[PDB]
Amino acid sequence: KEYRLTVPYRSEVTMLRLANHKAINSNIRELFKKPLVMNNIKAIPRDLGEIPRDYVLRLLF
Amino acid sequence: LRKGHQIVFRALEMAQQGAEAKGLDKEHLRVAHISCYPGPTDKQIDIRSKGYYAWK
Amino acid sequence: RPHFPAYNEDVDRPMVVPPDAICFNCDKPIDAGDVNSYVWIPAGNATVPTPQGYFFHFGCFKCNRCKYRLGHNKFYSKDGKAWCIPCALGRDVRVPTRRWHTSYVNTHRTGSRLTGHFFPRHSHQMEFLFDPN
Amino acid sequence: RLELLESMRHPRERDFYQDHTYHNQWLRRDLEKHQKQQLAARYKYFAPDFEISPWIWYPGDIVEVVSGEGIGQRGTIIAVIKYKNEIVVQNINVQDVVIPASESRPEQ
Amino acid sequence: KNSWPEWMDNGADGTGYGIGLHRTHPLSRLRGNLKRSPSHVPRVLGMMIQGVWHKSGVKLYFRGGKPPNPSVHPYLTGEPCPLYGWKVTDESVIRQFNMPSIDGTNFRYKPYVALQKPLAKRLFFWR
Amino acid sequence: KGWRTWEYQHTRPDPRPFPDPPVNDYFGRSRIWNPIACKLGYVRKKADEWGWPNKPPPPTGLRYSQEFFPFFFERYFPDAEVRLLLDSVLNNETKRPVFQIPCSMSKVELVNYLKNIYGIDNVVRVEVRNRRGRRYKNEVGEIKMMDDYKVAVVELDTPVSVELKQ
Amino acid sequence: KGGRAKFGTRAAESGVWNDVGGITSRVVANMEQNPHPGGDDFGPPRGPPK
C-alpha cells in the first residue's frame, strides 16, 4: 500500500524497513516497533558498578 | 475454447469409433442429430455473511 | 516513535570482537565470532578490563554472589565480579519467581545495540565533512 | 469414465475434502429408503421363521412344475436350498452361467 | 478420605509417578480408584477424557489421542517406591501360566478328532 | 389461571428434548467406555456364575476363594489369545518380533506366557502400545470393529526368523 | 458489550471460543507442592516412632 514499496526501484532504506526478521545485525528499530511478545528484545544491559562510578566521580569532583 | 466444445469433441470421437465398428464410412459421416437435455444435479453450500447461506 | 536510530554507524569508532576475549564472572576465554554464546555490552570505552565493552557468557551473566538472574537486566561490577542491585545495595537474597540461574538477555550485543555510540560521534567530525578541506 | 470426466472438467474449478471429511464417518446411521428396500427385497430369508415347516422336498423326489415357466414339466430334485425355500430340479430352469475371464483362463 | 491410596491421587514421586485409574483383582487385597458409583463416575470420566494435569507441566494419565479403557487394564500388583521402580505387593495377581507335560497318553492327543495341493488365490473358502 | 385438564386422557407425553439411547453408536478412535453400571450386568453375571435363579448361590467362602469356578477355570484353563505378527519374522532375521496381546495382559504376564507355553526363555524387554480395534465397513455399509489388542514388541537375545519357501 | 454481541471481547482471532468440550477437571495434580505426596506413611518412615 506504500508508494515506496510500489515504486519499481526500491531504495536501500526501503529495503531496510523490510528487515523484520529476528536476526543478528537486523533493523533494530523496525524490530522494536512490533510488540515485546512478538519481538525477542530483552531489556538493555546497562553496566553498573565501580567502572562508571569512579569515572563520573572524577568528572564530577 | 469452450468446455462444451471439448465435451462434444469427446462424444464425436466415441461416436466415430462406434460408427467405424458398425461398418460405416468415415469420410462420409455427418452429424445428423445433436441435442442436449438436463440431467442429474448436485448441490453445494454457499455460506454468506451475516449468518446467511444458500445452495449452489 | 522509537526515537533511536537503527544500524548504528561505527565509522568513527568501529566496535569489533577482539581476538583475545575473556569473561567477567569467569575470566576464561570465549568464542570470538563462530558462536554468539557470549554477551557483548559495548560502550565505546577503553577502560579496563576488556576495552570497548566487556563480555559475559549466557549462562554466567548471572550474579556472582547469590548466583541468580538480574532484575532489570542490569548488573553491578564489584571488584571484578558482576553482582545484582539487591546484592550490591546490601538487601536480602530474593528468589525470583521466573527463571533462577539465567537472565533475559540477547546474544552478541543485540540487546545493547539500540543504545550507545552512533554517528556522528563528536561535533568536529561533522564540520570535517561540510568543509571542502 | 472418471479420468474422462476429470479431463473434461476445467482446472480452475476445485473440489475440496478429497482425502478427509467434515463430518465423522464412523457414526452408525441408516441407509436410504430405496437402499433399505433393495435389501429387504433381495434378502427375504433373513426374516424370522422364513423356512417352510415341515420340510417335504428332499433330493430324489419326482416333482411336477405347477405354475410359472416350464409348467407341467416333471423332474427330479437335485439340490435343496432349505433356508431359502428353493429347489433345484433336473433339466428345469436351465440358464447360462457366465464365468469371467481370469489371467490364464478365457471367459466360459 | 478415599479407599484407594493417596499416590493414585498424587504420586509419591515429584514427577507424579503412579497417577491414573488402577483396576484390582476381585480376590486381591489391594484397592484401586476405579469405582462405578454415581458419585465416582464424574472423576472416572474426567481421568478418561480430560486426563490429569500435573503441576510439573505434564499430563500423567492421558495426554491425547486414544482414551484408555480402565475396564481392561491389567490388575494392580503393588505400589511404587523411590528406591526401586515398583514393589510387587500382590503376587497372586500376576498370571503365572503353567501347563502340564507329556506324562501319560498326552503324545496321542491332537487338536482335532479324526472323523470316521498347490494353493491358489481364491476369493472365498466355505469350509 | 388453570388449564382445561379435563379434556386429556391420563397419559404421560414424551419430553420435548428426547433422550438419546444409552447404546454408544460411535466406533471411532475416541470411543469411551461407559463407567455407569446397570442392573442387567449384575443379572447376567450372576446367571453366568451360579445359574441364577435356578441354582442356589454358593457360600461366601467359595465365592471369594480361588476355587470359585470362574477363577479356577481362568487359572487351570487359561484363555489368552497371543498371536504373532508374521510381518516381523517372515523372511527377515529380526531381534524383536511383534505380538498381538489381549489388552488385559501385562509385560510380565506375556513373558510368562512365552516362557511356559512356547518356551521362549530369551526375552530382554517388552514395549507395549494400546491400539483401538481394527474397524471397517462391509458391502451394505454397516460399521464393524474387531476386538481391541495390544502391540507388544519383544526384544530377544538371538535373532529369529521364519523362512518362506519360494 | 465490546466487539461482537454473542462473543463479546473474545475475539475470533485470539483463543478458542469454548474451551470445555464435554467435561474439564479443574483440579491440578500436586497443587500443594508437598515434599512427599504419597500419603501420611509411604515408603521410608518419617521421624522417629512414638
Add this chain to the structure above:
Amino acid sequence: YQRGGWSPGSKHQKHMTLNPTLYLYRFPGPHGPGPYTMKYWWTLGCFPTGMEVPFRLHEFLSTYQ
C-alpha cells in the same frame, strides 16, 4: 429470512436463526447423484459430506461374486 424451501436441497436464501443446517459441503440433488459427487464416490470412497453410508452391494455383486 427463509425466502424459499426449508430442506437443504432447496434453492433460495436461508438463515441460521430460523433454519439452522449442519455443514453439508456437496451432496447429490433431488434427481440423482451427479458426476461431481460420483467423483468422490470413486476416489474418496464416499460422498464428501460423510453423512451418506457407502452402499456398494450392487457393484460387489457385479464384480466379486
Add this chain to the structure above:
Amino acid sequence: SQFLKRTFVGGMGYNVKRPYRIEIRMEHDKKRRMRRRNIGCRRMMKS
C-alpha cells in the same frame, strides 16, 4: 473478443477489494507456515 471488448460486452466494473485481500492472505500463509499449520484456500465456498 476484440469486438466484445470494444462494444463493452460484459461488466464494465470489476472487483476492488481483491488486490489487497490477496496480499493479506499471502501474509497469512506466511504466518501459517511459521506456526506449522497446513495452508488452506482463501475462498473455499465464496467462489
Add this chain to the structure above:
Amino acid sequence: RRRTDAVAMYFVEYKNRDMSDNHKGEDYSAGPERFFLPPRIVETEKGIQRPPHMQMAFDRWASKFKTEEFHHWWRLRHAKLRYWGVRNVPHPSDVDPLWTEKEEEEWHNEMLANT
C-alpha cells in the same frame, strides 16, 4: 493456449542457435524426459561439447534432485495440492519417484553417448 486463463502463449528464443557455445544443436520441438536432464539434441549434433563451467553448474543443479528428500518433497507437494482442491493430482501412495537407479543409469548412458 493456457487452459487455466485462456491466455495466448508465445515461444521466445534467440536466433543464432548454431553460432552459440551453449545450446548448439539443441532441439526444442519436445522437452526432455525430466526437467533436470539435459535438453534434447539432434542426431546431427550428437558429438557436440558444452562449456565445462556451465556443465558443472548443470550437473550440480541436477544432482540436487537425485536425493530421497526430493522424493519426499514431491509426495508432500502431491499431498498439499490434493488438500488445496486441485484436481487430477494422484495420491502420494500412487505417485512414483522422478529419479530411480535404473533410469539414472540409462540416462547416464545416453549422456555419455551425447558426450
Add this chain to the structure above:
Amino acid sequence: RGRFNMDEAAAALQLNPAYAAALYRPLNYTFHIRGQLYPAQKGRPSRPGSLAASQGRMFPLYQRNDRLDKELFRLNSRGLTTE
C-alpha cells in the same frame, strides 16, 4: 565433486547425524510437538484393486524419533531422584 552432505557434516561436527538432519525440517515431523498434518499424507486402507497406503511407507524420513525426542526435550528422572 565434493558436494555438501548432511551425514558428512554431522560426522565432522560430531552432531548426531539424525539430529543434524532433523535440524533442517519442521519439529513436528521428528518430535512430539504440536503441528498440523495434511490429510492426504496420512495412510488410507486398501481398496479392491489397490494396496494399502501407510504413512510410514510413504514418508519414512518424516517419522518422529522417540530417542532424540526424549534425549533432547523430555527430562530424565535419574538426575531428579533424591532419596
Add this chain to the structure above:
Amino acid sequence: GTLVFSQAMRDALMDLERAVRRKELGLEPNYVWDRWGPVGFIDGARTDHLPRFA
C-alpha cells in the same frame, strides 16, 4: 550387590572424590561439607542444596 545410589548421593560422592583428587595432587583440598553444621554453613551465609543441576 551395588548400593542403590541416588543423584544426591552421587553428587556427595563427587564432592568426596574431588577432595580426594585435590589431596592426591597435593594442593589444599576444600571439602565443601566440612563448613556445614547444624544451623547451616559455618562461615558462609550462602545457601546450597543437593543435588546440583547442570
Add this chain to the structure above:
Amino acid sequence: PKRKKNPMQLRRKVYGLHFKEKYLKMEEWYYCPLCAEPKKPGEWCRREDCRQIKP
C-alpha cells in the same frame, strides 16, 4: 422492482450482434502443411519446422 421475464424477452439477446459473435460463429482453418493438423492463420506450433518457416 424487477419482475419475471418471459421467454420472448430472453430470446431478444440472440437478435443482437454481441451474442452471435461470442457464441454462434465458426473458425477459418486449413491443414498445417507440416503437421497435417487443423490450423488458423497467425498462430503456429512448437516445432523447429513451424518456428522457422511458420505457415
Add this chain to the structure above:
Amino acid sequence: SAAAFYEFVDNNFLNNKRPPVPGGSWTVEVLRNKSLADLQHIWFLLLKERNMLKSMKEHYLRHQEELGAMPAPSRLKMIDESMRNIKRVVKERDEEA
C-alpha cells in the same frame, strides 16, 4: 529359539501347500470320559492351535489384496467348539463338587 516361532506359523502356508480341513472336534460325549489333566492338556493344545490360526487370519487380513481369503476357515470354529465343550465338562464337574 526359532522352533518356538515356527509353531505360530502354519507349515502348509510356509511350504505353499493347501491346508486340509481336519476331521471334527472334541465333542462333549467324548470329553466326559477324560480326566482333568488330559482335559487341560488338550486345552493347551487347542490354545496353541488357536493362536496359530489367529496369526494366519491376521496375516491374511493384513494382506487381503495380495493373498485371497484364508484357506480352510472352519478350523477356527472347530477350535472354538472344542474349547467350549471342555468348559462345559469342567463346569459340570465343578457344579457336582
Add this chain to the structure above:
RNA sequence: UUAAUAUUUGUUUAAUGAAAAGUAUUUUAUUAUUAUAUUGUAUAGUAUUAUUAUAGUGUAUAGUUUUUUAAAAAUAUAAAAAUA
C-alpha cells in the same frame, strides 16, 4: 427470472516445544538408551481449508516455498509543478 450476473481465479517462503480443543482406521509411527508395573503423544475456534502469530517457556541469518488476465468510465486508496 434475476443470470451473458455478483463472487472465486494460486508465478516466489524472514519464523521455532505444552494444556485446554480437535479423534482424522498412525497396518509394527518411530528403535533405540536407561530402568523395572499401568496409562496415554501428529490436526484449535469464529455454522468453512474464514480479516486470524490462541503468546506457556525459550531464542533467533534454515529465505522453515499454492494468487490469473494486453486498453476504457465511476469508485476506492497513494502520490500529486517555479500558483494561491
